Amino acid sequence: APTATVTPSSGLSDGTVVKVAGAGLQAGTAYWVYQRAAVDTGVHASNPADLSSVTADANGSASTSLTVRRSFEGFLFDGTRWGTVDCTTAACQVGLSDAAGNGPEGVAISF
Amino acid sequence: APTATVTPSSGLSDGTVVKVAGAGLQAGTAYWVYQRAAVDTGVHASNPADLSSVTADANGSASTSLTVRRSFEGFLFDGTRWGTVDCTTAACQVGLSDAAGNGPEGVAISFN
Ligand SMILES: C[C@]12CC[C@H]3[C@@H](CCC4=CC(=O)CC[C@@]43C)[C@@H]1CC[C@@H]2OC(=O)CCC(=O)O
Ligand SMILES: C[C@]12CC[C@H]3[C@@H](CCC4=CC(=O)CC[C@@]43C)[C@@H]1CC[C@@H]2OC(=O)CCC(=O)O
Numbered sequence A: 001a002p003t004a005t006v007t008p009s010s011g012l013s014d015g016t017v018v019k020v021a022g023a024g025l026q027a028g029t030a031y032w033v034y035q036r037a038a039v040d041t042g043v044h045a046s047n048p049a050d051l052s053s054v055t056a057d058a059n060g061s062a063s064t065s066l067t068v069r070r071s072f073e074g075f076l077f078d079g080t081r082w083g084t085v086d087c088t089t090a091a092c093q094v095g096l097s098d099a100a101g102n103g104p105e106g107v108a109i110s111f
Numbered sequence B: 001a002p003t004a005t006v007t008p009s010s011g012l013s014d015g016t017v018v019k020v021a022g023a024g025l026q027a028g029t030a031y032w033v034y035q036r037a038a039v040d041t042g043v044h045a046s047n048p049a050d051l052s053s054v055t056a057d058a059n060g061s062a063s064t065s066l067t068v069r070r071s072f073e074g075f076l077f078d079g080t081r082w083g084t085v086d087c088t089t090a091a092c093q094v095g096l097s098d099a100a101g102n103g104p105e106g107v108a109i110s111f112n
């Protein structure tokens, strides 16, 4: 199954740059690399401002840089502006999803 | 039918804030407000960095502010990083799309 890692994923400050890496992804496919938090069970609010992506190489691997924030203006997948999200108490993680919502499990990060 | 407007939409500069307004929208529905450019027939590369949204009110109306860029990192609807889009030569516009791709037609914008 698809895996992902965020290094470093702890002791992060606002504006910190981390490396997001995916493995066991499908070659050639694009995966949205983004910061998020579940404002409801199974319902994620993300940060498009610093969003980015990645296309798994022939071995289904890829990594990139992501700028994380302690707090960010979160939007839902349906486009709705949810509101400001403070990762200080919210369980923010870095997601890796393709255009159909598939990919590895979100990686918990903390500040 | 849904309709959109961008003011200003001419003589714009990198960093300019414009008013994007939608009408004839589904009351209660959210619509992404974003800058884009067609890099191919029916294929747009958007600017997520300054992306924003709106949620139509009871009368299917809604507006908000959007910061525009002369240049930006473009992304395709499927998540692909396309490349740098330069609105100096690219026909850039402003989109208003719901989670299903529905919404008014793109509004053409231009820079100085
Ligand atoms: C209340 C809550 C933690 C605080 C979250 C809230 C969702 C809304 C929310 C957004 C923020 O950015 C601030 C924290 C916060 C208000 C979460 C919904 C369920 C959750 O509960 C837990 O922490 C789960 C307990 C556990 O760790 O097992
Ligand atoms: C593309 C997507 C909606 C747009 C999301 C994307 C995750 C990355 C992302 C972060 C943002 O803050 C902007 C929107 C966006 C680019 C989501 C991953 C799956 C999702 O789609 C769905 O809700 C599921 C579609 C379905 O299979 O019905």
Ligand SMILES: C[C@]12CC[C@H]3[C@@H](CCC4=CC(=O)CC[C@@]43C)[C@@H]1CC[C@@H]2OC(=O)CCC(=O)O
Pocket: B032, B033, B034, B046, B047, B048, B051, B075, B077, B078, B097, B098, B099, B100, B101, B102
């Ligand atoms: C949601 C969407 C993909 C994600 C796009 C969104 C437009 C706004 C936008 C700007 C970005 O730069 C991030 C992705 C994103 C948030 C698109 C509008 C329609 C599109 O999806 C479809 O083609 C619709 C497929 C379907 O019928 O489910």
